């Protein structure tokens, strides 16, 4: 039975590599340096546009770029999830419900892989946007990203690799407590299989790191808090900002 | 072989998405229309009495109310096709202006492709299949409104004779969206590479699903000619209503799709 868990761990790792182009292993090499164009101010940003082609006020244009990347990440996560044993066999409404609530948690988890205390990798790690330059953005866009940076520093201190995160990300999607689910049993049943695989992966991959499993599950709290806080900021934005309004079709795509 | 396996993977992915993006499928539509069942029976609207009693039975001047109701449904459909488009591998990775352009031109060709699923020679399902509004009643509407649906009906009767199922339609409406020949497209090349891969998937899907149906692929592609024609007629028709009906409002999303269209 102990080998059925290693098979699952490897399966998910292999699926996670295929599904996510920029991985933690790679993102770390770029950040440590073992090279990316840096954006520290308005002049560097406007050269960034020039020398890095990535798809009105700066603050608004930056926030919207973060959204266009988030919509991309949603498709990468959807693909990944369909490789999780049991997932495609679930009721289609449940599959949609699990992805609807799980994507934000998984976005901010994986964004930690692209972050250090100084800034975040953007455009497949072609760019690096400084924490300071983002804080400098006129309110309320100033402390848009500051909560994610604070999560990342704490999350990154667990020194998880792609092999650990692959299983953790699966655990997040198979949350049996999402609103509106029709058949909670097979979901919880899969998450229990994924939690065993994670427990074992963490004991084998981090033998000296005591109760890492327990610490990693506690981070679930930090994720949902970050997501509720991000959702609250979208309300404050939508209501108090006029210059948001895009092309009506664009508004449909980027809900 | 492994090349075919990848095309079956893509076919299955698009079907799965199609089913999640569109509540009323063709499989459901036909089960309602071929009226085999006791629970799925549609209320039929053939005249003014039937329309007014339909108010109490189904939850939602006459010709205007139909057209305005038919408008909000078109909008609801654009929202559904937009959600489906995001699921097409590569679509959200394209230049954002191109994404908008593919939908601007794509959505009305797809609205009328899928509307065929809700149509037989006699009428069209409405209100998520709870209602059925007869072809005659729609044609008996005041000028010019009498003439909106007739060409769609003419298309639907021909198109429905190909006997496509939802799995075929998912790939087909993907091929429509990823059209490189749309006016104003910045990056045509990445779109054709996607459409090429979709077209390979459809070719295989049609050969496996309809192996006794010779050159269905060819015949299906040729139907994209008839869609363009329907869209054009409709656009000319809107221009005329705009002018004779100054006291009737079009929904902005549709106004924006038609703005500088062909």
Swiss-Prot record, chain A:
GO terms for biological process: BMP signaling pathway; cell differentiation; cell fate commitment; cell maturation; cellular response to hypoxia; cellular response to insulin stimulus; cellular response to low-density lipoprotein particle stimulus; epithelial cell differentiation. Belongs to the nuclear hormone receptor family. NR1 subfamily. Induction: (Microbial infection) Expression increases when incubated with M.tuberculosis or its lipoprotein LpqH; induction is TLR2-dependent (at protein level). Phosphorylated in basal conditions and dephosphorylated when treated with the ligand. May be dephosphorylated by PPP5C. Ubiquitinated by E3 ubiquitin-protein ligase complex containing FBXO9; leading to proteasomal degradation. Ubiquitinated at Lys-18 by TRIM55 leading to proteasomal degradation. Ubiquitinated by E3 ubiquitin-protein ligase STUB1/CHIP; leading to proteasomal degradation. It comes from Homo sapiens. It comes from the Eukaryota. Its main location: nucleus. Highest expression in adipose tissue. Lower in skeletal muscle, spleen, heart and liver. Also detectable in placenta, lung and ovary. It is found in: Nucleus; Cytoplasm. Nuclear receptor that binds peroxisome proliferators such as hypolipidemic drugs and fatty acids. Once activated by a ligand, the nuclear receptor binds to DNA specific PPAR response elements (PPRE) and modulates the transcription of its target genes, such as acyl-CoA oxidase. It therefore controls the peroxisomal beta-oxidation pathway of fatty acids. Key regulator of adipocyte differentiation and glucose homeostasis. ARF6 acts as a key regulator of the tissue-specific adipocyte P2 (aP2) enhancer. (Microbial infection) Upon treatment with M.tuberculosis or its lipoprotein LpqH, phosphorylation of MAPK p38 and IL-6 production are modulated, probably via this protein. Rosiglitazone binds at residues 67-70, 104, 230, 254. Residues 4-255 form the NR LBD domain. The gene is PPARG. This is Peroxisome proliferator-activated receptor gamma. The keyword Metal-binding applies. The chain holds residues 235 to 502 of 505 of the full protein. It is linked to Defects in PPARG can lead to type 2 insulin-resistant diabetes and hyptertension. PPARG mutations may be associated with colon cancer. Obesity: A condition characterized by an increase of body weight beyond the limitation of skeletal and physical requirements, as the result of excessive accumulation of body fat.
